[PDB]
């Protein structure tokens, strides 16, 4: 089996450079059946570029492919923040019709602090025997992000869980959602619940805080 | 319009078998070879294998050889690939791609893509969600602008569709991707930002949908 190798595992790029990828083959293929594919996330593959340099139909003038053999380049002239997403080669003129392991690209942008809101739980949640208290990151970069938990002045730990959105294509910002779990009974025994967040952005740690 | 529509998500035990659909629309379905590949979750792609236009004569890898079984029906216009003995590295989201073509000419290369098909195997039985809003209060306010949101918790597997009043709200969501919850269930919150003074005249619609356990619920967030 023709094995595909892209290099490299991740290129983080601010928007107008050039982005260049790589895919190498273990042995040659054919240019008119290498192909160029862009999954943005939650969507289906996209084909970009066909026969090693044949753009597309729909596929802009900046992206452009180029190579044979066994060495072929993907290049993104002027890169744009919509065009963050994992891009795959495929070869498919020797079966199996192997794949590369893809290359993620990034967007850099200037450093934005995160807006923090929470959300106490609902009353239907709390019919339920259960607590889920919400941290809201909306809108930073860069992603590194750190949540802490605090009722009544006592860090907790082990009993949240964060997410992040994938990189927004339109601002290039994150967002984080940290989820606090309590009992209904060990909820109903305090009153300060806090989020602490310290980010790069934030010249000291921002707390929002509500009482029950 | 040129497209290709895949089945819903699926859970199956281990061992079992899965068969994705993958109908056609737009162009000459049979003029039209199919290849079939998986990614799984945080993976790369991975091909199963294609069948030519016209017949039944299909070609696997050999990953695959000896339980997919790739088919293809003139007369409804469906490709399918049916996978038997499911274990638990089956675990992945499966997409079915075709070149378009009229009665004559073909593109040279794989530009139809479906949506894709989420197959979970884990002998875990299939739960739905509930839903919970997250009410907007003075404590999710920032500027001019509050943040609202539903959150969709303790349902497996994946995945969940979650829109804002029925699509009529895109501007300012955030879906988060979902976490594994120690329960086995899984737990996920959108949340979207909207001006303060909205609050009071405009009504607010999450709407969720966890096709392997056909629940759909609306959820309307009202602020608290
Ligand atoms: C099929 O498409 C090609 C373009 O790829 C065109 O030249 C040809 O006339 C079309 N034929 C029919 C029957 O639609």
């Known amino acids: 089996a023709i094995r595909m190798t892209q290099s490299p595992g991740t290129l983080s790029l601010s928007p107008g450079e050039r982005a260049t990828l790589s895919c190498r083959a273990s042995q040659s293929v054919r240019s008119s059946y290498l192909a160029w594919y862009q999954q943005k996330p939650g969507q289906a593959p996209r084909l970009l570029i066909y026969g090693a340099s044949t753009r597309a139909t729909g596929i802009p003038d900046r992206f452009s492919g180029s190579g044979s053999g066994t060495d072929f380049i993907l290049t993104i002239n002027r890169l744009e923040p919509e065009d963050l997403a994992v891009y795959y080669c495929?070869?498919?003129?020797?079966?199996?019709?192997?794949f590369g392991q893809g290359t993620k690209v990034d967007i850099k942008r200037t450093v934005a602090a995160p807006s923090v809101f929470i959300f106490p739980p609902s009353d239907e949640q709390l019919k339920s025997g259960t607590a889920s208290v919400v941290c809201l990151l909306n809108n930073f970069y860069p992603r590194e992000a750190k949540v802490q938990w605090k009722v009544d002045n006592a860090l907790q730990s082990g009993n949240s869980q964060e997410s992040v959105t994938e990189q927004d294509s339109k601002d290039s910002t994150y967002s984080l959602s940290s989820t606090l779990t309590l009992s209904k009974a060990d909820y109903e025994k305090h009153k300060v619940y806090a989020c602490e967040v310290t980010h790069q952005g934030l010249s000291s740690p921002v707390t929002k805080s509500f009482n029950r | 319009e040129v497209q290709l529509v895949e089945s819903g998500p699926e859970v199956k035990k281990p061992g079992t078998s899965v068969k994705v659909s993958c109908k056609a629309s737009g162009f000459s379905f049979s003029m039209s070879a199919m290849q079939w590949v998986r990614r799984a979750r945080g993976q790369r792609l991975e091909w199963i294998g294609w069948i030519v236009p016209g017949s039944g004569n299909a070609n696997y890898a050999q990953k695959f050889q000896e339980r997919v079984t790739i088919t293809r029906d003139e007369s409804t216009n469906t490709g399918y690939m049916e996978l038997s003995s499911l274990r638990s590295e089956d675990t992945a989201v499966y997409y079915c791609?075709?070149?378009?073509?009229?009665?004559?000419?073909?593109?040279?290369?794989?530009?139809?893509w479906g949506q894709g098909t989420m197959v979970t195997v884990s002998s875990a039985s299939t739960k739905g969600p509930s839903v919970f809003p997250l009410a907007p209060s003075s404590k999710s306010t920032s500027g001019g602008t509050a943040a609202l949101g539903c959150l969709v918790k303790d349902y497996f597997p994946e995945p969940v569709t979650v829109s804002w009043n029925s699509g009529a709200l895109t501007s300012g969501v955030h879906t988060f991707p979902a976490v594994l919850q120690s329960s086995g269930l899984y737990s996920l919150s959108s949340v979207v930002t909207v001006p303060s003074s909205s609050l009071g005249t405009q009504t607010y619609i999450c709407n969720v949908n966890h096709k392997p356990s056909n629940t759909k619920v609306d959820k309307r967030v009202e602020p608290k």
């Open positions: 495929q070869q498919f003129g020797s079966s199996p019709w192997t």
């Open positions: 791609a075709a070149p378009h073509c009229n009665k004559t000419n073909c593109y040279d290369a794989f530009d139809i």
